[PDB]
Design an enzyme around this catalytic site. Structure first.
Site, short mmCIF file in Angstrom:
data_model
loop_
_atom_site.label_atom_id
_atom_site.label_comp_id
_atom_site.label_asym_id
_atom_site.label_seq_id
_atom_site.Cartn_x
_atom_site.Cartn_y
_atom_site.Cartn_z
N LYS B 157 1.18 -2.84 7.86
CA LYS B 157 2.06 -3.99 7.85
C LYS B 157 3.03 -4.15 6.56
O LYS B 157 4.24 -4.19 6.90
CB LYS B 157 1.15 -5.07 8.54
CG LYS B 157 0.39 -4.77 9.60
CD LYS B 157 -0.55 -5.89 9.68
CE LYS B 157 -1.63 -6.14 8.81
NZ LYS B 157 -2.19 -5.15 8.26
N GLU B 183 -1.82 -13.62 1.34
CA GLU B 183 -1.95 -11.94 1.06
C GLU B 183 -2.74 -11.69 -0.21
O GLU B 183 -3.51 -12.53 -0.89
CB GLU B 183 -0.62 -11.54 1.13
CG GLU B 183 -0.34 -11.38 2.55
CD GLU B 183 -0.79 -10.44 3.37
OE1 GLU B 183 -1.29 -9.17 2.91
OE2 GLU B 183 -1.19 -10.86 4.67
N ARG B 184 -2.58 -10.56 -0.65
CA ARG B 184 -3.16 -9.96 -2.02
C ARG B 184 -2.41 -10.48 -3.10
O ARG B 184 -0.97 -10.20 -3.04
CB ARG B 184 -3.36 -8.73 -2.06
CG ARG B 184 -4.17 -8.02 -1.03
CD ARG B 184 -4.24 -6.62 -0.88
NE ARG B 184 -5.43 -5.98 -0.22
CZ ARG B 184 -5.14 -5.77 1.01
NH1 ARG B 184 -3.98 -5.80 1.58
NH2 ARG B 184 -6.10 -5.23 1.86
#
Ligand SMILES: Nc1ncnc2c1ncn2[C@@H]1O[C@H](COP(=O)(O)OP(=O)(O)OP(=O)(O)O)[C@@H](O)[C@H]1O
Ligand SMILES: Nc1ncnc2c1ncn2[C@@H]1O[C@H](COP(=O)(O)OP(=O)(O)O)[C@@H](O)[C@H]1O
Lengths: 505, 472, 50, 188, 168, 239
Positions: B157, B183-184
């Site tokens: 993604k 997110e990261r």
């Protein structure tokens, strides 16, 4: 002798604290059932503050209300009795950090269980520290040489690259990170701290006998001088198992913020999720998918985000994390792992059938991958393994294709034979890490088809034979791979001659 | 005047503020509390009565005392906007966390604004060519439309988003807003590295993108509002500037999850599965501000996490109602090494009409979907018996469809570190003629492997030549 | 060295049952009576600190 | 500006009764009416306490309120309507709690900072008196406000003493010190 | 047993005084608890079931649950402008909508408000929301077709003027 | 449970006496043994042979614990154990019995295991022996713990099991170990519930079993005593 009574009597002198024992905290316990306790009073308590009950058991005040405060226990409720006196520490839950923690074996609170006296702590650090922001980071550029063959070959690890080890029960999962720690003996015997790499193993919810044998084994190979064991065994309370990896993460942050490099290993986050849903259901909070509270993604998130590579502005510290997830029958679509996969920087899948075929390590290459490991692979390994993953996926394509017994052309049968040789190549016994200088020539032989004439059963003795051959003879090339980490064309051709020499036998 | 409140309850990131002044601040206003760590922001969730409200935290709430003084700021969380915000890494509060000084904006607009009305709506059929094969064939992207990336755990993604950004954002001309939600942190850092190195962020010069972040480390109340922050920034440039706004959202599911985690602590009865009852409403208030007015054009791309590959989960099923062009990533397609792992069937578009994409494009995509549906129907008999127990027309169809599947995969310049293969920016008309010749079966002689991970049909010819010269 | 550490631990557990012996020594005293005055003067010292 | 909180559950009757009564003082008079009505509940313990049951009625509850106001001028001021509401609200059973709690709020207004000097055996008066004045003149009490003090007997403790008040305590007793004596010797 | 819902400090205080303000509120109500578009509102004894009400902010709401303490009112706009204790006016209407010929072409909300922006709405009458369905006796068996224009729809599942048919 | 310092840091092999067990799936001295297989295969005969082999070999004793045991079958077991001589009513019975019958409330059956545990812990820590704790059934014990947590009004967790399942297991398992005084080796039968291994009660039990033993029918079908399947009975100490 009496010197323990001397030290304990100096601690009795501290027990000076009674002359300044005017605690602004003490309050009665309203109720205390099902791993929780409602306490009246404590009107200057802080949120997520450590308190201590009258029976010595500590606790964390987790939810504050007008009227009472709900404090979780850190042990059995058999010790806590209703109506007692609950002193607060004055602190958000902190743990001892420092270099003297090396070698020791502690609880979730830094209280040592090894029976080796007190802890030489260099300070106390909070549990729920913020993860560092995006600016004091750096993309990983330094290898983590695990010592395993297919791990260092196919899924290289950066200093701070958050790599999941996922597998099933009794599938060789623990032995992977164990032998990684045992490989770190090479540089922990050394002198350069940036080459050094410190190991924290976090055994939660497991058998005390298992942890004892693990600590015993780490003393046998003498990894203990750089090891820190956090024990949160299955007899202990669920909040302890909830809490302990955060504490070990604070320890890893202590090492990382000193510029040093450190490794933390979580084993396992699966039981931590069990303990956390045990907490939340005893918090009467509603569950979600598979009876878990919906914040359990945020739980392992906020845990694993405190592990990265610091920039040079921060002193270039790093903290690499190895979580372990026990799944159920090779499922990768349960709610707990799919969360972790969305967090970590890659996967190391252990297929149960490969270990059922005795192939140890039981690495499914087709599932296992790292995302940014190629940026920090050893440069020689990056040179020699470019066709390797391609050839192994190629052999995997003709793996299921060749089960029908149909004869094939020399190309696909060639890939079949060489991939059989590479498959039987990458087995490796426990407690047998391999240096990079040792791993290079096996790859160089495996790429260039020299194993094809060798018997498939002969590969295991061939490995050690060719290694002892080179260590006897081409020890200069081993030093070249050690010093450079990168093969020149002259080193390439000398390597070719040194291989094909022993390939003649 | 300061409207002083007192802390009465602390539960996680949910805190209760009593007042003795009867002038209670209204819903969605911003409270703040001086911490020893500085300040902390609360958002007014609900009047609980008794001059006492329940609020959501924008930060971790550790070490807070009941009865601590609570200060009101009057309004909602106003965010700095404008060209000052270009190339700045902004907190949910509106704090520049790039440490490059404060965002010296003119205007700070509150995040909770109303969606544009029905008269302000605008329709468009401006097809965006992406260069990606399966998008430009099976689900074309509308400029000004809304684009969904439905995906499971880690199935390409973020890589696909970076591929889209690398393909589009330079050749865009308007502006762009990325918003990393849940997110990261490493992914945001690496994206910032790219935006510097691509020169999309020009640190000393002028950039074209604005960065709103806040990651999975952040407490959920921060995660429940960061999308509104990037939203307000985007709709400012849509309205004040009247430009073309690329809004990249990752991950929109994290927003609904942040709405889920607090709702049990906000006194709500738990709804379906474990999500909040106010799912579709909050989803609607988020999506209906993401639109294309008569004033400006907003082309948004949103990644959608799928929980445990269950598309019958209420959050992505609700998300399908808001999107113009679906794109679904299957893990099983990725397990065949097919990158990107877009499902060829389940991707849809409000585009792809024969009077829109051209008749021939529509016909080619129709025959491709028929062929792949035929293959997926025959899949079980292939699993039991194999290709031998087919009829020869069916066998030819299965052969051609499996050629097509490997032909769908496309080398990415972003995932070059996974491949060592240069990326393929494949044009639209060449892709149409390529699939045309494949449906015509002009390359049935060429084996299946030469279709794998390829550019145009000329590259299939080249790879078949390489396999003929090498495999021999 | 193994037996040395073993002897240290045996010394420590024998002093633990000696701690039991010390507690049983402390139990039967009018230190129960006198130590009330200890608390008295003590609490005087603590509350006179403020 | 309310007093010290009764914190929610069922002190809120007493809380509202105070803070609506106090707007015009009379809380000593309302207080004495509460003392007198809890007294005549106590002076008629058979069906004064045994008739705070919930299973009666609305009408008969109101008639018991009528029997309470029938007893001379037992009720005075808001405290009857209090009971009118309480009777209707049928929270009459938890009436004892309200009383004691209003007493706590009232003697907080006086400033009687109730304390305690826990022991395992009652002590001589000289110790009581010396301790009494100690805390009284201590920073704890800011003066202008009193200082009760109660010795209690606790077997669960092994002796010594512990001083308590204002959720602030000092233990210099024996039991805890033995505990600390066993903890320190519990290490290697 | 458990805290009841008409026991807040701001409401019992007034009842202790003997002012008895709960009886005065018959056509109005105060906002006890507004949140999530949900208003627990004290007062409004003369309210009806499924009755439209209005707030002093200007947003309108529907009374659904008639608890003995308070009224549950859901909101047809945001709760962004509603506070505790705000005055609540009772409309006096079961929720009705304007109907008529001029609605053709127009685009409205649930409440007949023209969202199309083509000016106001020319109604003919106003009808209730929960109008009772017709009985058995004033019915005809359906025979007049509905022309769908689709082949297999008209061929296999023909639609008559009067029946209902689920597109699932 | 005994402390981490008291854990014996290397599991030796408990020499049972039976050829197949000592050959294929060796038992840890102080380990956990998952016995499978339904009745009628001489499982009781197998475990009585284990009792005599420990009594002759190591001299440690046996404590049997029927949690939820069928009272008729408990009677037949007791009568057989009298008749096979491991119970001598006048001389030295080599075994102690605890039978929490099925007709006892779940508060009993979630404690019968701890009763037998404490009895075995005494003969370990007083006599310095290797004592064998035999438990049937761990799954009925899990049912008992789940029912106890249900009757206490706790919210049930997954599968309908108790939310304290890992802790309720760990309070039973970690009190079974090898001290320096001796060891308690525990053999316990495991009913697989509706033939599923992702069921969390066998998935919890398998997180503690170091060795498995399978009494198949097919081995007893061939007239083989014991009825041990060679292929399935595996140990983590086959190294
Ligand atoms: N390379 C190897 N050499 C020898 N034995 C191995 C190797 N890899 C795995 N094993 C065996 O696999 C078994 C399981 O080890 P390990 O504990 O790592 O598996 P696991 O899946 O981690 O189990 P658990 O999760 O219960 O700890 C061990 O008994 C070990 O002997
Ligand atoms: N073109 C490609 N070739 C090979 N692998 C890819 C490709 N694109 C994506 N991937 C795989 O997808 C993964 C990216 O997961 P992604 O879904 O982007 O993460 P997130 O879940 O954070 O969005 C990487 O591990 C990468 O190996």
């Amino acid at each position: 002798k009496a010197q323990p009574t001397e030290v304990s009597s100096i601690l009795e002198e501290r027990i000076g604290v009674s002359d300044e024992a005017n605690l602004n905290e003490t309050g009665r316990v309203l109720a205390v059932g099902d791993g929780i306790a409602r306490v009246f009073g404590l009107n200057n308590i802080q949120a997520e503050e450590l308190v201590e009950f009258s029976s010595g058991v500590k606790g964390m005040a987790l939810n504050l209300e007008p009227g009472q405060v709900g404090i979780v226990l850190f042990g059995s409720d058999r010790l806590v009795k209703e109506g007692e006196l609950v002193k607060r520490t004055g602190n958000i839950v902190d743990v001892p950090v420092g270099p003297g923690l090396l070698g020791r074996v502690v609880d979730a609170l830094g209280n040592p269980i090894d029976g080796k006296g007190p802890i030489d702590a260099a300070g106390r650090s909070r549990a729920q520290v913020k993860a560092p922001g995006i600016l004091p980071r750096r993309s990983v550029h330094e290898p983590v040489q695990t010592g395993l063959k297919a791990v260092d070959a196919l899924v290289p690890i950066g200093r701070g690259q958050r790599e999941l080890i996922i597998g099933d029960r009794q599938t060789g999962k623990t032995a992977v990170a164990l032998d990684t720690i045992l490989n770190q003996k090479r540089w922990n015997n050394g002198s350069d701290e940036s080459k050094k790499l410190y190991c924290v193993y976090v055994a939660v919810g497991q058998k005390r006998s298992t942890v004892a044998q693990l600590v015993q084994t780490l003393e046998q190979h003498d990894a203990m001088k750089y090891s820190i064991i956090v024990a949160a065994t299955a007899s202990e309370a669920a909040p302890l198992q909830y809490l302990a990896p955060f504490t070990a993460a604070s320890i890893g942050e202590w090492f990382r913020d000193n510029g040093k490099h450190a490794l933390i290993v979580y084993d396992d986050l699966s039981k931590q999720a069990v303990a956390y849903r045990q907490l939340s259901l005893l918090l009467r909070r509603p569950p979600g998918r598979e009876a878990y509270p919906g914040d359990v993604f945020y739980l392992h998130s906020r845990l694993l985000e405190r592990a990265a590579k610091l920039s040079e502005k921060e002193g270039s510290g790093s903290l690499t994390a190895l979580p372990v997830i026990e799944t159920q029958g090779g499922d990768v679509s349960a709610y707990i792992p799919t969360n972790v996969i969305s967090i970590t920087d890659g996967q190391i899948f252990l297929e149960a059938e490969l270990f059922y075929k005795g192939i140890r390590p039981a690495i499914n290459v087709g599932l296992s991958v790292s995302r940014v490991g190629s940026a920090a692979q050893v440069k020689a390994l990056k040179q020699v393994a470019g066709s390797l993953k391609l050839f192994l996926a190629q052999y995997r394509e003709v793996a299921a294709f060749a089960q029908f017994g149909s004869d094939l052309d020399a190309s696909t049968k060639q890939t079949l034979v060489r991939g059989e040789r590479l498959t039987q190549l990458l087995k490796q016994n426990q407690y047998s890490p391999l240096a990079t200088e040792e791993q290079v020539p096996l790859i160089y032989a495996g790429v260039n088809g020299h194993l094809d004439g060798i018997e498939l059963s002969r590969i295991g003795e061939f490995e050690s034979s060719f290694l002892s051959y080179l260590k006897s003879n081409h020890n200069e090339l081993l030093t070249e791979i050690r010093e450079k980490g990168e093969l020149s064309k002259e080193l390439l051709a000398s390597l070719k001659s040194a291989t094909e020499s022993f390939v003649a036998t | 005047t300061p409207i002083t409140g007192k802390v009465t309850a602390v539960i996680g990131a949910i805190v209760d503020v009593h007042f003795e002044q009867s002038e209670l601040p209204a819903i969605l206003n911003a409270l703040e509390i001086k911490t020893p760590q500085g300040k902390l922001v609360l958002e007014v969730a609900q009047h609980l009565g008794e001059n006492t409200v329940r609020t959501i935290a924008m930060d971790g709430t550790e070490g807070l005392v009941r009865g601590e003084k609570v200060l009101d700021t009057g309004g909602p969380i106003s965010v700095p906007v404008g060209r000052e915000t270009l190339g700045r890494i902004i907190n949910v509060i509106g704090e520049p966390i790039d440490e490059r000084g404060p965002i010296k904006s003119k205007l700070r607009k509150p995040i909770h604004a109303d969606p544009p009305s029905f008269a302000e709506q605008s329709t468009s059929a401006e097809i965006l060519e992406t260069g990606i094969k399966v998008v430009d064939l099976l689900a074309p992207y509308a400029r000004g439309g809304k684009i969904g990336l439905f995906g499971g755990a880690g199935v390409g993604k973020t890589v696909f988003i970076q591929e889209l950004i690398n393909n589009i954002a330079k050749a865009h001309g308007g502006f762009s807003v990325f918003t990393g939600v849940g997110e990261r942190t490493r992914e945001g850092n690496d994206l910032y590295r790219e935006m510097k190195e691509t020169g999309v962020i020009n640190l000393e010069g002028e950039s074209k993108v604005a960065l709103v972040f806040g990651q999975m480390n952040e407490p959920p109340g921060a995660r429940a509002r960061v999308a509104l922050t990037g939203l307000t920034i985007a709709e400012y440039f849509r309205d004040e500037e009247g430009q073309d706004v690329l809004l990249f959202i990752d991950n929109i599911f994290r927003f609904t999850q942040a709405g889920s985690e607090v709702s049990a602590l906000l006194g709500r009865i738990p709804s379906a599965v474990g999500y909040q009852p106010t799912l579709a409403t909050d989803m609607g208030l988020l999506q209906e501000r993401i639109t294309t007015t008569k004033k400006g054009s907003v082309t948004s791309v949103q990644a959608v996490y799928v929980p445990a590959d269950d598309l019958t989960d209420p959050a992505p099923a609700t998300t399908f109602a808001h999107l113009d062009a679906t794109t679904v990533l299957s893990r099983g397609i990725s397990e065949l090494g097919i990158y990107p792992a877009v499902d060829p069937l389940d991707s849809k578009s409000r585009l792809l009409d024969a009077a829109v994409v051209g008749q021939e494009h529509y016909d080619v995509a129709s025959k491709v979907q028929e062929t792949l549906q035929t293959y997926k129907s025959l899949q079980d008999i292939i699993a039991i018996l194999g290709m031998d127990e087919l009829s020869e027309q069916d066998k030819l169809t299965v052969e051609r469809a499996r050629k097509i599947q490997r032909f769908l995969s496309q080398p990415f310049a972003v995932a070059e570190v996974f491949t060592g293969i240069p990326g393929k920016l494949v044009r639209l008309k060449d892709t149409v003629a390529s699939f045309k010749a494949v449906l015509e079966g002009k390359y049935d002689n060429i084996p299946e492997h030469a279709f794998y991970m390829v550019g145009g049909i000329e590259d299939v010819v080249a790879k078949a030549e390489k396999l003929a010269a090498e495999a021999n | 060295v193994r037996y040395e550490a073993s002897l240290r631990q045996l010394e420590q557990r024998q002093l633990a049952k000696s701690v039991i012996s010390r507690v049983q020594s402390e139990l039967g005293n009018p230190k129960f009576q006198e130590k009330v005055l200890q608390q008295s003067i003590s609490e005087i010292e603590q509350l006179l600190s403020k | 500006p309310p007093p010290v909180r009764l914190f929610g559950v069922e002190g809120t009757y007493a809380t509202a009764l105070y803070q609506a009564a106090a707007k015009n003082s009379s809380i000593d008079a309302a207080f004495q009416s509460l003392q007198k009505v809890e007294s005549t509940v106590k002076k008629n313990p058979k069906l004064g306490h045994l008739l705070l049951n919930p299973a009666l009625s609305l009408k008969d509850r109101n008639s018991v309120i009528d029997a309470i106001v029938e007893t001379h001028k037992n009720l005075d001021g808001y405290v009857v309507n209090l009971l009118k509401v309480l009777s209707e609200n049928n929270r009459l059973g938890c009436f004892e709690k309200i009383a004691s709690d209003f007493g706590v709020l009232n003697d907080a207004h006086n400033g009687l900072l109730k304390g305690t000097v826990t022991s395992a055996e009652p002590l001589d008066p000289k110790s009581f008196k010396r301790i009494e004045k100690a805390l009284s003149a201590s920073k704890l009490v800011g003066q202008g406000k009193s200082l009760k003090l109660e010795n209690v007997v606790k077997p669960e403790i092994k002796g010594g003493l512990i001083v308590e008040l204002g959720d602030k305590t000092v233990d210099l007793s024996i039991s805890t010190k033995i505990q600390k004596l066993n903890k320190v010797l519990e290490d290697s | 047993t458990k805290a009841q819902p008409t026991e807040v400090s701001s409401i019992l205080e007034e009842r202790i005084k003997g002012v008895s303000d709960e009886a005065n509120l018959n056509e109005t109500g105060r906002v006890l608890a507004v949140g999530d578009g949900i208003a627990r509102v004290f007062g409004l004894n003369n309210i009806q079931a499924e009755e439209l009400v209005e707030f002093s902010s200007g947003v309108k709401g529907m009374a659904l649950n008639l608890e003995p303490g308070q009224v549950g009112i859901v909101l047809f706009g945001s709760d962004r402008l509603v506070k505790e204790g705000e005055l609540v006016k009772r409309t006096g209407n079961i929720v009705d909508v304007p109907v008529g010929p001029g609605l053709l072409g127009r685009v409205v909300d649930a409440l007949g408000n023209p969202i199309d922006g083509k000016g106001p709405i020319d109604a003919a009458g106003r009808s209730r929301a929960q109008v009772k369905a017709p009985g058995i006796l004033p019915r005809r068996s359906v025979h007049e077709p509905v022309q769908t224009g689709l082949k297999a729809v008209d061929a296999l599942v023909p639609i008559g003027r009067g029946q209902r048919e689920l597109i699932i």
